[model samples]
Target: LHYPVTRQGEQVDHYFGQAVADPYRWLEDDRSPETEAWVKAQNAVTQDYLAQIPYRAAIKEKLAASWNYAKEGAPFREGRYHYFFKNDGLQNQNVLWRQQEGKPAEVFLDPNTLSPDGTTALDQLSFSRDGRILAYSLSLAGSDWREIHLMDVESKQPLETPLKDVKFSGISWLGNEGFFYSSYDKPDGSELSARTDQHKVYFHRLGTAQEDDRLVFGAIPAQHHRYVGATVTEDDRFLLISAANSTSGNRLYVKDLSQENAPLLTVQGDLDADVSLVDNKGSTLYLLTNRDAPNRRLVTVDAANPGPAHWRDLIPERQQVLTVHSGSGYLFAEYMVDATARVEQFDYEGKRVREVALPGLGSVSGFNGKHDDPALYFGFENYAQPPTLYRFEPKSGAISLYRASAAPFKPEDYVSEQRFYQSKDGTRVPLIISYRKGLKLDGSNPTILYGYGGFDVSLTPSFSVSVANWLDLGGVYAVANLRGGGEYGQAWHLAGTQQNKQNVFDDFIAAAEYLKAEGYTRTDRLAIRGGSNGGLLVGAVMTQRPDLMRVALPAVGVLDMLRYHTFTAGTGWAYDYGTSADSEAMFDYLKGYSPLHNVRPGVSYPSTMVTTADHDDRVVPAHSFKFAATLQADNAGPHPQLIRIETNAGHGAGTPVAKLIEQSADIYAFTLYEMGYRELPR
Candidate 1:
């Protein structure tokens, strides 16, 4: 394989007393013409190599066939209309549709029409209490930056000028007159990779221009927060504010919107725990917090005395991790029991209702609606099964299928097995392996082990058409619930963060070992893969254990750990990965496992295909660019070391369906081809 010749500069940064050299630091300037040329050259090399695989086209076709399924989102009621999202087969984006009682469903918004190539996406949609007005956000080229627009719901006509430069924000209406949103001031450097540290919340009245929008909170530079969110209670009686410096914990406040000149009352003054204002019954507020309970619990407090000291437990946290939602005047508690979903109903007064029976052992989402909604809807899915929408009557506790998946594959032909494995620290981690049914326990089956062990994110069993295509071609897919995940609780998450990040890698490596030891797959037939933080997991494990797998796929990974916090909103991740400037010990610890810094000159690394987008402003493409450059130059392997850079795309979200299909085909092709398969197994 002829890899692109990447130029290195004599760039070095001093951290503590140690000097670290960054040869490919020039690649971080994504706006430079030199970097653009390099991206084009590297992509050409990757595509040329992938095109040589005989079965690459076949895998793509099969993947497309599996992906051509009608998908629907759970419907919610608002102002005499039920709204839902639908994707017809291979549509580039899901179309929002609405229907009234005894009326035909009609398309409310079609994002495919927003762009010629369908790169524009409807990032969010919020309806006013009466549903007379709608606020929708559009994201172009998969970037986190968004433009908020207003529309009249009945007429489906544009209302006001679009709000520009919004990122990591939510639109919560104070009433029909105004709404609250969050954003940071425009950066002076390249928007794709520049640092965006301070986030502020503002209230935009419907009749006023965005320039006249009032700053609600986070105005002080001294009290900078990376993420600030505001929401209005269902009755519009109170406004809730959540401010956070990192991803996990937040400081909460609430303002009485019913009274003029009301001060913002502190609900949780410090970031010691995560607390959110969930709902309210008159002046009694429901607060969800992990203050004393690592798994989280729901509590209630009066508006007159809104503080942690006066809070009373409503539904206390159980052994499993708890997440609360509301619908039909009832609290829907979703629990993650070993990374799978379990739901229980509770009244506002805290009396436990009957458990909501799910169809199978899988994940459940969307058990939320208006307080007066007659029925609630939720979606269920597993590794082998596409998501199926279910309608549940809160009063009767009756569950019925609203929509069955129209995917090409059958669920019965696939099987999911849950297993527990011990990590290097002897900590038990959960893993779910999914493959075609009636599969022999042969030691030579090609497998892809996936994991993400940071940011308290949970890896639950969910269906993907690409994974289904892999299974159809007789491949194994295993997912490990590592230490940095929210599967167990906050304690489990803390174990895999910062200095203890190695626990995540060890947990993942142990999952691979468990597969090999159980006669599932050997090292030569295995591929380790993950995205974003999971991408870091793959890069770290492969560099640490070079002989453990044949292929490594790290997509949009945070590889340059030493300088990660200097990038866009990367400082917010200091909770999970302490910056290199924190202390000499921290710098040493980060440099020891930082994927970009750890690449050796003579090690036979795995056949690696690093992936990132040009518009990935979240993690930034420099991480992949520098990592691939280092791997290509240093890796002493016969296998191909390549980087696949997607053009006009951002960090994985809002990517067009066509681009998604192509990328998946290329990835599966690369993985299988590197695993010594000339042709995909039938």
Candidate 2:
């Protein structure tokens, strides 16, 4: 296939007195017609190559078959109705359904009907305090920019006006009068690529227009925050504001909404401490922080003098990281023990209740609801199993199966196991591999290794329809719990951040070598895959060790480490990825491992498919564009260096199921084809 010729320009930069050429820098202009033309040409070449794969259509069919199932989320009460999200097999988006007590369920909102191509997605939906109104945010064409709309809950009628240009915000209602949200002023340049650093919180009154909305926070230029959010207490007595200059930690501010003209008080002013107001009992506030505890702990403090010095620990930190959720007058402390979940309930006064018995080793989510809610719900799933919803009774410690996924896959036919591997630095890392049962332990089995090792995110086991299809096709799926992840808490994260970022790449490389050493897969039969930060992981690993895998998939990655901090909210990621401008040493360190800068001129690189969305404002598509352009021009190999650009898409979230299925099919097809497969393995 003929690769698209991405015209280059004379763009060079001096970093630490070292000249670096960025020939493909013109691709950063996302709004230019030349960029769009280049994207169209690249996709044409990629799709043509994919069409030549004999089993591409078969893989798509199989993916769709597995994806066709009735999926439902746990129900939560709002006002007089309980709402849950459900999909009746193959729907582009999930439909929000509601029930009135014991009555029949009906559709409250179906996002599929809102757009012709199913590109517009319902990003978030929040109910008013009285549940009389619903404020929902919609993302158009997958961009981070959002439009918020309000509607009457019972009548299902739209409000007079919808708020525009909202981003990185939460809609927290203040009684029935209005709500608070956060956003940046509309950018003067391209909304998709321009830098939007200063995030401001605003208050929207019920009967007023957005132009008349009150500026609640981040209005002062001297005190600008990268992210500002307002959350109203469930009791509506207090409003909390969290301001963060970066992603890791935030300064919390509290205001008593109960008192007229009440002054906002600083709860925790330290930027190095991560804190949040968990729950409150009158003037006594329950807080969760990693101030003195890296694994985090629960503390209690008086609201009148809410300072770190005046706080007392209610639940001390343990070896396992703690995540708290509250319901039915009790707190559910969900701890990650080596990446699997173990939840323990506790009373408000810090007395340990009982460890909530779980069905198996997997991830558990949603053990929270209103304070007086009668019951709590949670969903559990692992690599080999689909999510099964369960009803948990907080008071009695009783758990009952609510609904099992209707996907046509037998959990009994699959085997999942965890094993620890050693990184280059002798750090022990955990890896989970899932595949069909009774499989031979030969090195010929095709495997896909996925990882994300930054942003304190934990890569827990979860089921996916695409993964099930891969298993059915005699493929292996493996995930490595690398450092820079929240798997072992903040210490593990710091080990993989900034100057120590190479540790993450080393950890991933060792995982691949471990797989080959264990006779699970060979280098020629393996693929390395990740998205966003994980995408960076794959890019770094592949560039550093081209012979480690046969195919590389870097979706929406931060490939150019030197310029990543120049885009939208990229500065906030400095905690994980230190910016090039931090210092001369930092610039040199970034250039050492940056994927876009490390493409060898005469190297035979892996068969790589660089993927990104045109509207992806988070890690802009320019990252993939520049990387793919460099690969195509410099690669000495006969393998296809291709880019698959998706239109009308942002980051991965809120993508239509149909689009997701198509993308997965393309990826699997490309991967298998690159591994010398002429047809289906079966």
Candidate 3:
């Protein structure tokens, strides 16, 4: 296949006296016809290559078949209705369903109708206190820009008008009066490409116009915050405002809506601490913070004098990273032991209640309900298993299966194992490897090493039909718990950030070496994959150590670190990725590792597929576009350095199921095909 001709530009920059050339800068103009034409040409070449793989169609069929299951979410009570989301296998979007008490399920909201190609998706839906009003946000083509809509949940009627410019927000209603949400003023430049750093909070009344919405906070130019959110107490007595400059830390303030002209009282007023409201009892707020505790702990703060100095530790931090959720006057603290989720129950006063008896070793989510609500729901799953919903009794500690996924393949046939390996600095990192049971412990198997090592995000074991099918095809899947993630806690996350970020790369590389040393697979048969920040991980690792794996899959990566902070809200990422403009040292550090800058001429990069969607406003396609161009120009090997750009698609979420299946099939085919395997297993 003829590679698409990449016309390089003369774009260059001097960062701290160092000249950097960005030759493929024109590809960043996503709105231009030239970029669109380039995308079509590149996709044509990629699709043609994919079409030649005989196993591609079969893989797509298997993926679609495995996806055909009636997956139901944990039911939540709203007013007199129990609402949940359900997808009947091949639906482009999941339909929200509701039932009145013991009545049969009826469709509540079908997102598929909102768009022709099922690109518009319901990003989030929040119910008013009484569940009488529903506030939902829709994402078009996976863009971060969301328009919020209101619905009379009882009557199933639309509101007078939808709220505007809402993105990355939560609609929290204080009683039935109105709701508080966060948004940015319409950008002056391209709404998709411009940097929206200052996020403001606004109050919208039920019947009033959006233009008349009161400015709650975050409009001040001197005190601008990257992320500002408002959450009301369950009792409706207090309105909490949380502000963060970046993802790492936040400052919390509370407003007594009960008082006239009440001042916004400070709970914590600094960017050095991470704090969040768990729940509240009258003037006492149960706060979770990593201020003094790296693993995080539960603390109670008095509203009258809520300050970091006055914080009383209710639940101390454990050796493992703690995650807490509350329901039915109880607290559920889930500790990530290694990377597996283990939940423990506690009383309101922090008494050790009991452990949540889970089905097996996997991830647990959906411990959501009101404080007085007696019922809570949790979903569990692992690498080999699909998510199974369960109704949990908060008081009695009993759980019964509420809904189960129709398994396309037997989960029992596969085996999941946890192993620890030493990084370059002798730091022990945990890895979860899954494959077919009773397989030979030889270094001949095809393997996919997946990871995400930044922003304190943990890569826990969760069920995915795509990964299960890969394992079923005699392939091995491994996820390494690197230092930059929240798997261990803030310290673990910090260890892999800034100057120590190389620890993340080291941790990942060590995992690959460990796999080979343990005779799991050869380096030639191994593939490295990650997306977004994980995409950055894969890009950096591949450029730094191209011999580590055969295939490098970096999807929507932040490859050009020198200019990442200049894009849409990319400044907020300084917590995880220190910006190049910070200082000369920082610029040097970033330029040294930035994949786009590091792609040297005559380097034999792995068989690579750099993927991104044209509508991806979060990470943006410019990162991938530039990286692919640089990679192609630098490559000295015959291995294909191609990119598959999805039309009208954003950053992974809200993507149509059909598109997801197609992408997965393309990825799997590319992985296996590039690994010197010409045929599929069985």
Candidate 4:
């Protein structure tokens, strides 16, 4: 019944590897039907342990306490402006859009409004240039295979189209009457081409049939990658498309739409390029490419002549392009600075006109420019502060604060600091350390170090009110910008994926050891945390070096790497963690450090908290459930091995201010109790 037999030949086969290795094998051999009943019994035992945890109640209480800290307000344009964001109060999960100074935000689209839907997710909202219409896509769960919906921005009404079972990839409004959209037959459809993995672009009118539509481009076998989109030029003369293949990098293709048979101007090349901006007036294109280096280069080309020969380097090799704000003849591009950002303006001739420096800005989330105006609007934020909007005057290189969203607490009250630590291989990993000034770090402070070193996502400085409770209770908070993140661009991300995944764990271990070395805290006082991919990080580090921590919080994590690809949305993660089904090398790599496979018998581990959710379609809750059971049965230590599975929650702690506060309270309480810290200060 158990697996991974111990030295004394005791039943140790309860691990994930043994459970799934022959899930149905026992059903056929044991004709008494006892095998099926035994499997059900095992699952029941696991669920019983999960149900006893105070996860839901704790999440509710934590979110309720931090309700006021949620961000709601946005900038007002032309006396009346509306925007859509997630609303916590809605039971069916609604995207609320409200007019500035209006009474309350109205539900633009409720998940329940969709036919045969339990929960619907909206994505890629696009407003017409004239601001009369809004185009968006809806999908159940977070699946990008979405159905396009057009809405009247003024009336907030939706228009019906004859499109069903057609997956809309990207959408754009060409004019008020007509729009451009792309669709591809589902890969699962029977009429799929040999190159069914390819994506095609199309131009569909607001009210038209398939025969009336124009074929922008046929199905091109560019990349089998997931989540590809096409962006059209403002003039509708050209389209910028992005696609990538495994082992190869992403490339941007420029296609001329004016021709009867639009030809690809820029073909997919060895270099990885991203289309940043396309000037509306002039046919100028701004792109970030790794033609010369892995990071990026700002290249400009006329849409009419987008050949490689026509491409001109604007902000050449040295600097990385963070963002681009297009204007008539001027292009404003932002560059990275010590993991922060600064903006610069360039003329059409590739000459730098002005550089606008933003002090204390950690990241630039959104950038916008008014048509026919030189004034540029941008939103910036850091880990310790909420978003702030600013207007940059290109002429004088001056920045004027436009708006500061409501902040429940003063930012000045909290202290944030940055530290660089030398990794085992001597690579300097940046760490953001934030805590109350008076908190002692003499090997006694309860510290939680969080890290996620996969994907191109850079953990920028963004504020979290829940962190306030940690600091108030004399706990230290730290975030490590380890390898595999976009902190240092493409190279950083590549170094943490596939065969190099172990580097991520090593980088995390180095961060923890660095904190201890700098007198931050000792292993017995530290708690390491990460979720999803970060959850993998937490699981890896805890099992790899359990002696280095007192608590492990892996939230909605992937513990069983060997079988993760079988779950929904889990197949896409092969870009980070290699698939074990086919590749023998990948299987070996995954088996070596996979948390579930590596859980050894008779080893004392920290007070481990394995968190997941029942509604988490991204990562199945069974991974955590099985891991917790295996740990409890195998561990030789007296420390508690607990599982906290929340109902009606997905990958993240779901919305609803009350729910978030409760989750935070439970986690904070667990950390305090495990690390022996005090309660939150009033």
Q: Global CA lDDT of candidate 4, please?
A: 0.65
Q: List, residue by residue over 1-682, the lDDT tens digit for candidate 2.
A: 8888778899999987889999999999988899889999999999999989998998999899889989999988887888999999999888999999778999999888899988889987988888889999999999888989999999998975899989999999998889999989888899888888889999999989999999998989855999999998889888989999888999998898889979888889889889998888898788999988999999998877888898899899999999899888999999998899999999989999998988899999888878889999998999988999999988898899999889899999999899999999899999999999977888999999999998889999899999988999999999999999989988999999999999999999999999999999999999999999999998999889998999999999999999999998888999999999999999999999999999999999999999899889999999999999999999998888999998888888989988999999999999999999998876
Worst 10 residues of 4 by lDDT: 1-10
lDDT of 3 by residue, 278-371 (tens): 8888789999999999999999988878989999998899899887888888888989888888898988888998987788889999786798
Q: Write the per-residue lDDT of candidate 4 for residues 1-682, one digit (tens) a residue.
A: 2222111213232233433342222222222355334334544543453344444344345445544533443342422664545444323344455555636756655555553333455656666767666777765443334567777777767765634333436677664555566665654422211123345566767667755777565454444443345777766666676654332355566766667866676644443444444454456677666565566676777777766667778767664535566653467776766567877778757788877667575877444544445566677777566677776666676778876766555567667888999887888899988887766567777789999888766787776767765765567899998887877767888888989999999999999998999988888889999988898899999899989899999987888888777554466567778877756677878888999778888999998877766556556665775577667667888677776655444566223333455567667766656665333432
Global CA lDDT computed for model 2: 0.91
Model 3: CA > 4 A from native: none
How far in Å is the alpha carbon of 73 misplaced in model 4? Answer: 4.6
Model 3 weakest 10-residue run by lDDT: 217-226
Mind sharing the TM-score for model 3? 0.98
Q: What C-alpha root-mean-square deviation, in Å, does candidate 4 show against the real structure?
A: 6.0
Which 10 residues in a row give candidate 1 its minimum summed lDDT? 216-225
RMSD of candidates 1 onward, in order: 1.0, 1.0, 1.1, 6.0
> How many clashes in each structure?
0, 1, 1, 25
Per-residue lDDT tens digits for candidate 1, residues 562-600, read 999999999999999999999999999999999999999
**Which candidate model has the greater lDDT, 2 or 3?**
2
